[PDB]
A paper describes a structure:
Several sets of host cell machinery facilitate this process, including proteins of the endosomal sorting complexes required for transport pathway, which mediates the membrane fission reaction required to complete viral budding, as well as angiomotin (AMOT) and NEDD4L, which bind one another and promote virion membrane envelopment. AMOT and NEDD4L interact through the four NEDD4L WW domains and three different AMOT Pro-Pro-x (any amino acid)-Tyr (PPxY) motifs, but these interactions are not yet well defined. Here, we report that individual AMOT PPxY and NEDD4L WW domains interact with the following general affinity hierarchies: AMOT PPxY1>PPxY2>PPxY3 and NEDD4L WW3>WW2>WW1∼WW4. Comparative structural, binding, and virological analyses reveal that complementary ionic and hydrophobic contacts on both sides of the WW–PPxY core interaction account for the unusually high affinity of the AMOT PPxY1–NEDD4L WW3 interaction.
To obtain structures, we screened a series of different high- and moderate-affinity AMOT PPxY–NEDD4L WW complexes for crystallization. Two such complexes, AMOT PPxY2–NEDD4L WW1 and AMOT PPxY2–NEDD4L WW2, yielded high-resolution crystal structures (1.52 Å and 1.74 Å, respectively). All five of our new structures exhibit canonical WW domains, with three-stranded β-sheets and canonical positioning of the two eponymous Trp residues. In all three WW–PPxY complexes, the PPxY core elements bind in an extended polyproline II helical conformation across the concave WW sheet. Each conserved residue in the PPxY motif makes canonical binding interactions: the first Pro/Leu residue binds in the “XP-groove,” where it stacks against the second conserved WW Trp residue (Trp525 in WW3). The second PPxY Pro packs against a Tyr/Phe residue from the second β-strand (β2), and its carbonyl oxygen forms a hydrogen bond to the hydroxyl of a conserved Thr (in β3). The fourth Tyr residue of PPxY binds in the characteristic “Y-pocket”, forming a hydrogen bond with conserved His (in loop-II between β2 and β3). In contrast, the PPxY2–WW1 and PPxY2–WW2 complexes make few favorable contacts outside the core. On the N-terminal side, the PPxY1 backbone approaches WW3 loop-I more closely (∼6 Å) than PPxY2 in the WW1 or WW2 complexes (11 Å and 14 Å, respectively).
Residue numbers in the entry:
A (entry chain A): 386 to 418
B (entry chain B): 237 to 247
């Protein structure tokens, strides 16, 4: 699925976003690699 | 608007 250290989650409106546990950031953008 | 913030307690 996702590259190492990354987690897929959902916000309060059900919208998918991504959690970067390597650098402690979040983004709407799915990581490519 | 932005996504939820990183969960800082999880650090």
């Amino acid at each position: 699925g996702l590259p190492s250290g990354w987690e897929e989650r959902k916000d309060a409106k059900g919208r998918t976003y991504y959690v970067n546990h390597n650098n402690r950031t979040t983004t709407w953008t799915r990581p490519i690699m | 608007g932005p996504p939820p913030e990183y969960p800082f307690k999880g650090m």
